[PDB]
Amino acid sequence: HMCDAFVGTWKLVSSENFDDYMKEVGVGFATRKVAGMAKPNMIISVNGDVITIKSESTFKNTEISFILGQEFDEVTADDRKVKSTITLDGGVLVHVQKWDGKSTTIKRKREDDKLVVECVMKGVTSTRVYERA
Ligand SMILES: CC(C)Cc1c2c(nc(-c3ccccc3)c1-c1nnn[nH]1)CCCCC2
Structure with a gap:
């Protein structure tokens, strides 16, 4: 029951500062533009000890x-x-996440009826809010 309140299908409803976060991570121009437009669904499920996030x-x-x-x-x-x-x-x-000597931390939390995803790289944070689909 560890992640019961995370399980479901969640649709992006807001994103703040994602471009600056992506720049800090090293994402190139074209990818930043296309990634920034999209409205993903995040689908979280649990089977035993295995958590899947799509x-x-x-x-x-x-x-x-x-x-x-x-x-x-x-x-x-x-x-x-x-x-x-x-x-x-x-x-x-x-x-x-560790790569090429770098690190970023992603926090996912349940707050009210939302799933809030906070991404941090050095001093730069982005917040992405998802609602039930
Ligand atoms: C939020 C992050 C933890 C995961 C993430 C990342 C990127 N793009 C996306 C993304 C996926 C689909 C549609 C639009 C954007 C997502 C993401 N957003 N929702 N799910 N996946 C690339 C940029 C650097 C950070 C990693």
């Missing part, structure tokens, strides 16, 4: 399946090849 959109489709605390390989929507570890900390999914 995104479906007009830009990219992504899928990660993982066990909390167990590092895995991920191909991000912007085509970084990263090493990811996701844990639960105080009810928040905390996802660290």
Whole structure:
């Protein structure tokens, strides 16, 4: 029941500062423009200990399946090849991605009827809010 309140289909409704976050991550112009337009659905499910987070959109489709605390390989929507570890900390999914000597942290939390995704790279944060589909 660890992630019960995250499970579902969630549609992006707002994004703040995503362009500056993407710049900090190293995403190039064209990818920033196309990624910034899209309105993905994030689909979260749990089967035993395995959590799956998918995104479906007009830009990219992504899928990660993982066990909390167990590092895995991920191909991000912007085509970084990263090493990811996701844990639960105080009810928040905390996802660290490591690549090329760099790191970014993505937090996913349930707040009211939303799923809030906060992405941080160095001093730059972006907030993306998703609602039930
Ligand atoms: C929010 C982040 C944790 C995951 C993420 C990333 C990127 N693009 C997207 C994305 C996917 C589909 C449609 C539009 C944009 C998404 C994402 N947004 N919702 N799901 N996936 C590329 C830019 C760097 C950060 C990684």
